[PDB]
Amino acid sequence: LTEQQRRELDWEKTDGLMPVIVQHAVSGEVLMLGYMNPEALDKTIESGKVTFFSRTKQRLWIKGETSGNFLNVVSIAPDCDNDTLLVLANPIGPTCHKGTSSCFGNTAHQWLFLYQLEQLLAERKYADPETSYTAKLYASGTKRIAQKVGEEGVETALAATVHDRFELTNEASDLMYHLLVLLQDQDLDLTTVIENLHKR
Amino acid sequence: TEQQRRELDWEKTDGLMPVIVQHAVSGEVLMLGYMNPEALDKTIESGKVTFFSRTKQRLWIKGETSGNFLNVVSIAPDCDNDTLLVLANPIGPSSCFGNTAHQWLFLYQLEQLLAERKYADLYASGTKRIAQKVGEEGVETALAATVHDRFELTNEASDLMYHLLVLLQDQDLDLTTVIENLHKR
Ligand SMILES: [Mg+2]
Ligand SMILES: [Zn+2]
Ligand SMILES: [Zn+2]
Ligand SMILES: [Zn+2]
Ligand SMILES: [Zn+2]
Ligand SMILES: [Zn+2]
């Protein structure tokens, strides 16, 4: 937030309490909505931790003050008419008091599933070979996982070349699953790949 | 939903519920508006996002000025029932929040741009040439992982994703269709 951006925030239209959307800075999941006054926004900038004004306790509260689940600020932006902020943040622990990542429960944009799939495949690392197909892959060693990425790339190429769109959909799915596993096996992740793509 | 609307905390929000609109596919936050109970009713029945103007100016279907409507996919309350999250599909341009975007949004945008570059100065070389790039970079990804060169593996996985998007677009598919396919398994 530039100084002039903060000058243009419409506190009078919001009656000194600005609605603030907190979104996961990587996955795009909407985590919560809270409210800020000028001092909450200022403490948010200075500390790097999302800080709200609690009308209940009529005090500032850094989200995580009593839970341990903080939101590390990555970015802050106003909307087109300056009466709502979007904070992109990294949660250190789950955001909702129900033990789950979002205060909005189980409604999620389509692409979130890919991120959740990766998360699941990254938990199954180092968690014994009949828990899942994934764990047994992990146990097979890097060479066998890479072998499946290679095979699935071949199947994807061939199904496209034959113009069998339904087979291309399924082999592309296989490719993605095994690529996720292979990246996890090498201490990487799709986020790293997307970043590398972004730089180019 | 029945119970969910029974349980919305209309009194806490002085009759006006904050409403986050988020792209149903990509996750981009598009806007924040406000809804009174009739605005939410009209939104549910019409399938188009309908707000109540906070200044004074009546009900208002998003797009009744511009042609840019939002088609409802999903509506959820947060945990203390004083904010709604609406997932919707826009029909007309993109976010009221400027350039800010979560990291994975870039993948979605890359796909879009790749579609827009069917008409530039790979695509022209046929399905076979793209499929060749996919197969070769699968090989290179497998080899780089196998020798534990994480930098090369990052670059090769990146090539592989980019060309996979090109191939899907070439066969009138996209990564959203693949993500949904993985979902149903
Ligand atoms: Mg390559
Ligand atoms: Zn606004
Ligand atoms: Zn919550
Ligand atoms: Zn396959
Ligand atoms: Zn709660
Ligand atoms: Zn709430």
Swiss-Prot record, chain A:
Location of region: Phosphoribosyl-AMP cyclohydrolase: 1-113
GO terms for biological process, alphabetical: L-histidine biosynthetic process
InterPro entries for the chain: His_synth_HisIE, HisE, PRib-ATP_PPHydrolase-like, PRib_AMP_CycHydrolase_dom, PRib_AMP_CycHydrolase_sf
One GO molecular-function entry: ATP binding
Highest rank taxon of the organism: Bacteria
GO CC annotations on file: cytoplasm
Location(s) in or outside the cell: Cytoplasm
Pathway listed: Amino-acid biosynthesis; L-histidine biosynthesis; L-histidine from 5-phospho-alpha-D-ribose 1-diphosphate: step 2/9; Amino-acid biosynthesis; L-histidine biosynthesis; L-histidine from 5-phospho-alpha-D-ribose 1-diphosphate: step 3/9
Catalytic activity entry: 1-(5-phospho-beta-D-ribosyl)-ATP + H2O = 1-(5-phospho-beta-D-ribosyl)-5'-AMP + diphosphate + H(+); 1-(5-phospho-beta-D-ribosyl)-5'-AMP + H2O = 1-(5-phospho-beta-D-ribosyl)-5-[(5-phospho-beta-D-ribosylamino)methylideneamino]imidazole-4-carboxamide
Region annotated Phosphoribosyl-ATP pyrophosphohydrolase, chain positions: 114-200
Keyword Transferase carried by entry: no
Swiss-Prot/TrEMBL keywords: Amino-acid biosynthesis, ATP-binding, Cytoplasm, Histidine biosynthesis, Hydrolase, Multifunctional enzyme, Nucleotide-binding
Main location: cytoplasm
Enzyme Commission (EC) number: 3.5.4.19, 3.6.1.31
Key word Amino-acid biosynthesis present: yes
Similarity comment: In the N-terminal section; belongs to the PRA-CH family. In the C-terminal section; belongs to the PRA-PH family.
Protein name: Histidine biosynthesis bifunctional protein HisIE
Organism for this UniProt entry: Shigella flexneri
